[PDB]
Amino acid sequence: PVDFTGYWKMLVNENFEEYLRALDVNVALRKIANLLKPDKEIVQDGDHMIIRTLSTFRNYIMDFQVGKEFEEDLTGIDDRKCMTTVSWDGDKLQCVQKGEKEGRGWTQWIEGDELHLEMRVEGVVCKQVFKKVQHHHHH
Numbered sequence: 001p002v003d004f005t006g007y008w009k010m011l012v013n014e015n016f017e018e019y020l021r022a023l024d025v026n027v028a029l030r031k032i033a034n035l036l037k038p039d040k041e042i043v044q045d046g047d048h049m050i051i052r053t054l055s056t057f058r059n060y061i062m063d064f065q066v067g068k069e070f071e072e073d074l075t076g077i078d079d080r081k082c083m084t085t086v087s088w089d090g091d092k093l094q095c096v097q098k099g100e101k102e103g104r105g106w107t108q109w110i111e112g113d114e115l116h117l118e119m120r121v122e123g124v125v126c127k128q129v130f131k132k133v134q135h136h137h138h139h
């Protein structure tokens with residue numbers, strides 16, 4: 001069965017600037033973010049999912065139950081709140097983020113040792129791919 005648990009190091013990060021611009025992330029933060037190579041530390045524990053998006057500058061932490069809508073606090077990204085649901089779709093994880101921006105959400109899946117993440121908002125697409133790694137990063 002598909003299991004996202006692991007530490008995943010960024011390999012490629014396509015069109016991130018335009019994704020952040022579509023979220024109205026301010027220009028100074030976009031400049032910082034353009035130099036980052038965020039990683040993912042994930043624990044899948046039943047349908048309780050923890051996804052820590054980690055960077056040297058700032059993290060964004062998700063901690064939710066698959067299937068259950070929650071209030072997602074996007075402080076540190078665009079500082080909005082979304083009513084968000086993450087759901088299984090076969091071997092993929094689908095996320096719908098209801099709120100100010102149309103078409104906001106993402107899809108996450110695995111191909112071999114690669115974690116794939118397509119982030120979407122307002123018709124803009126950012127695609128990230130991470131490689132599973134084994135050297136422990138201190139919490």
Ligand SMILES: CC1=C(/C=C/C(C)=C/C=C/C(C)=C/CO)C(C)(C)CCC1
Pocket residue numbers: 020025029033036038040051053054055057058059060062076077106108117119
């Ligand atoms: C803008 C910005 C950042 C963007 C984080 C994003 C966009 C996280 C998306 C997480 C998802 C979609 C998780 C499912 O794997 C981080 C915090 C890296 C650094 C500071 C500024």
